[PDB]
Design an enzyme around this catalytic site. Sequence first.
Site, PDB file in Angstrom:
ATOM      1  N   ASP A  90       0.791  -1.210   0.000  1.00 18.60           N
ATOM      2  CA  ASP A  90       0.000   0.000   0.000  1.00 18.60           C
ATOM      3  C   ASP A  90       0.830   1.271   0.000  1.00 18.60           C
ATOM      4  OD1 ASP A  90      -2.052   1.832   0.395  1.00 18.60           O
ATOM      5  OD2 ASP A  90      -2.593   1.144   2.400  1.00 18.60           O
ATOM      6  N   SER A 102      -0.875  15.835 -12.175  1.00 20.44           N
ATOM      7  CA  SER A 102      -1.130  15.390 -13.529  1.00 20.44           C
ATOM      8  C   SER A 102      -1.401  16.644 -14.378  1.00 20.44           C
ATOM      9  CB  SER A 102      -2.307  14.408 -13.556  1.00 20.44           C
ATOM     10  OG  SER A 102      -2.735  14.157 -14.887  1.00 20.44           O
TER      11      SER A 102
END
Length: 330
Positions: free
Chosen positions: A35, A199
């Site tokens: 994770d 992004s």
Amino acid sequence: STGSATTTPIDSLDDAYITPVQIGTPAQTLNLDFDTGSSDLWVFSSETTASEVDGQTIYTPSKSTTAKLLSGATWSISYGDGSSSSGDVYTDTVSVGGLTVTGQAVESAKKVSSSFTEDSTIDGLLGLAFSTLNTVSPTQQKTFFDNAKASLDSPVFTADLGYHAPGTYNFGFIDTTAYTGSITYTAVSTKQGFWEWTSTGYAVGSGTFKSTSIDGIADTGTTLLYLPATVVSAYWAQVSGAKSSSSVGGYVFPCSATLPSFTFGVGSARIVIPGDYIDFGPISTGSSSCFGGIQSSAGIGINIFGDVALKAAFVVFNGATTPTLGFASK
């Protein structure tokens, strides 16, 4: 030193990936969920409440010659989905694909929520976010990656997740045969303790690329892609019959529809997620309504590039003094 381990999806929908990890001496093999959205290495153990264990392999510190109780230390963690766990702490030897760390904090679960109990295939989590998120008190502990950093040939780990297929987690090296073209690197902000990046935009199917900054985290522990409401509405508007359902808790679509692809920007590069990766199948057995892999982050407060996005790319997590994220097509 380097490490290399195969990661396998737990089911036919790629809900989660498990990787074998060796704990203790002699080795006890547990399948953990790697994770990058958390920083605790916790496992089901001989101390977990018997009723809350259902099929999991447990870690038994009394059978390990290298296990030491970390006197007084406790841990308590709550995840984004509302699940939680807590217990005491041991130190022990931990190996991942031949890479060994001695004296790693292994958090033994005394109590786990029903979400973990029901997932019989997951024996625990191995957190790969920054050590600032670790919940051990009064003395905060380091992640496996942080402990292994000095010994690694390069301070990096790579995630190469498969679509309905096994993948690979590598530590200390970049496999140049696992990707095509170049790796595009992008800045990481460690302010919140996550692998947080920006992004440069998105495109729906064969549509025009929209340049717009989307701040989010690279999270291997989250199944879906959670993006702002504006982006998610623009994607589901291209699928006939798609709608947001309050009963289901997200966007659903007719199982008979074809899904367009979704492109996200990494600097000047583009990562294309095929339409098939966004299909999470029927909401219930026999239903003709299917669950979407692209959901709104409005209720969460953070954008998450989960397994849906990460499995479309070869991902480099660079843990150098100035951390970066690398993305390549594969």
